[PDB]
Amino acid sequence: IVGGYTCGANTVPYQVSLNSGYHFCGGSLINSQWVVSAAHCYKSGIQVRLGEDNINVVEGNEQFISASKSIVHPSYNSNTLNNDIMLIKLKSAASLNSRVASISLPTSCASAGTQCLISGWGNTKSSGTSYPDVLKCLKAPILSDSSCKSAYPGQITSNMFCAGYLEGGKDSCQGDSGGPVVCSGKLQGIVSWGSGCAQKNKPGVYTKVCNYVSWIKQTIASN
Ligand SMILES: NCCc1c[nH]c2ccc(O)cc12
Ligand SMILES: [Ca+2]
To answer: Which residues are listed for Ca(2+) binding in this entry?
Structure first.
């Protein structure tokens, strides 16, 4: 997260870290046994880490649970990032509490202008690299579809939205991939892609979760 703030330990209780020997992606806990992330985060041998603040220190509220199954969306296109969403089933159910909690799925799509919270352990600089150990947070509005398509001509599908600031300076970045965009207590987006981080006229692009609610629910009910 570039230009954000330190969230505070366990203030984003649905945030997960995906670990394959090291943190490589975020995700969101949607019930005691399922995580939603980006399909571009797919790999084998994932351990899901819940209750994390400092990802390099055991602080006492972590639950580490291996993934039993990963399901990339059937229509994911890795070249366009259309349908950039994946579900991960945990080998066992997490223990839910005040610091480990699920985030609800939306019943309706959010409109441009809605303020949302984006969080992750990604790079904090727009040039060069500095990766934080503690969770970073960013408040950003959803942008109009016309401003999003004007920023990325020919690249924005109906399954994507832009959020952030056209002036630059504040954005998600590398390592925030797969993480949540939460607006009014509902999961509306997944950190997906962009042109660099925090660049003028290049806001972050996010997977539009409201379009996938029926796929998520049907998949969870049968796996
Ligand atoms: N807005 C952050 C977009 C994003 C997701 N993954 C990334 C990886 C590298 C990068 O420069 C940018 C990204
Ligand atoms: Ca920790």
So the answer is: 52, 54, 57, 62
